[PDB]
């Protein structure tokens, strides 16, 4: 119905082979060539290296080291009202607002299912029916680690296999279920504000997802849904994170 070369590429391109290839290159200690790619990236995407702990591009041994570069604490002060949930990621708001029954906005006019986002987990969907959602978009120029909006006890993590569509205005408007079909990690926490999900969704090239408690979840890509549980916070074996603390990140591969 829409006749777009770019949309066709999303379906035509071997997005996974490209993601693997880029992950291979981004893991190489390639000295001057590593440094060149980083300098060209920083120039083309207008990265603010002043915000990084190591502002010198020669300090990074691999591209991925640079892509996941840490910031200076002082440059992201954590709001101190314990009634304030804070932004988990640097970037822009894609969409946000009320979950209209099961319905989340992907773009103006274009909905998707909460149950579909949560891989058919109707019991976890029930926690969030008629609740609230925020979708943050991280770009190549942004810091690529993700932090807690509030204190949380980790209860549940679900790895979901999927595609590696690009994320932009064309895909957000034209690929149905973009965030519900792309590879992703669902994290469920107990918080003071009730149950909270923080879902990390991959994209072409930026396909690798880590959490601080499990390391790299993907790659490799084994094709199946995997579920992990943790007990309530009063119990041995529980996992606890503070507001503003790092909980995961994205990288190439």
């Amino acid at each position: 119905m829409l006749n777009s070369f770019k949309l066709s590429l999303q379906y035509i391109l071997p997005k996974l082979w490209l993601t693997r290839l880029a992950g291979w290159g981004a893991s190489k200690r390639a000295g001057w060539l590593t440094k060149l790619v980083i300098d060209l990236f920083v120039k083309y995407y207008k990265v603010d290296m002043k915000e990084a702990q190591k502002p010198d591009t020669a300090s990074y041994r691999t591209f991925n080291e640079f892509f996941v570069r840490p910031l200076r604490d002082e440059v992201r002060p954590i709001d101190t009202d314990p009634n304030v949930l804070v932004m988990p990621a640097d970037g822009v708001i894609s969409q946000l607002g009320k979950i209209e029954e099961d319905k989340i906005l992907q773009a103006k006019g274009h909905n998707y299912s909460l149950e579909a986002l949560l891989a058919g987990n109707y019991l976890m969907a029930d926690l969030f029916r008629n609740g609230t959602f925020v979708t943050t978009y991280l770009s190549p120029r942004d810091y690529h680690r993700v932090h807690m909006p509030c204190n949380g006890i980790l209860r549940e993590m679900i790895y979901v296999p999927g595609d590696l569509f690009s994320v932009n205005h064309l895909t957000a408007q034209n690929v149905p279920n973009l965030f519900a079909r792309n590879e992703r990690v669902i994290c469920l926490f107990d918080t003071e504000f009730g149950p909270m999900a923080q879902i990390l969704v991959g994209a072409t090239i930026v396909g690798s997802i880590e959490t601080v408690w499990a390391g790299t979840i993907t790659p490799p890509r084994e094709g199946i849904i995997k579920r992990w549980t943790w007990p309530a916070g009063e119990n041995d074996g529980s996992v606890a994170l503070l507001k503003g603390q790092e909980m995961g990140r994205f990288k190439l591969g």
Binding site: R76, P77, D79, P88, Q95, K108
Partner: protein, 34 residues
């Protein structure tokens, strides 16, 4: 990239000035308890 947050019904109000293409920075306000 993408990070999606889900919160339970009645539990938070989004900061009222936030909309599509609002700049996000780790640690800035996103929502308040009710």
């Amino acid at each position: 990239x993408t990070v999606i947050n889900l919160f339970a019904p009645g539990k938070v109000n989004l900061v009222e000035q936030l909309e599509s293409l609002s700049v996000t920075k780790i640690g800035q306000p996103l929502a308040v308890s009710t």
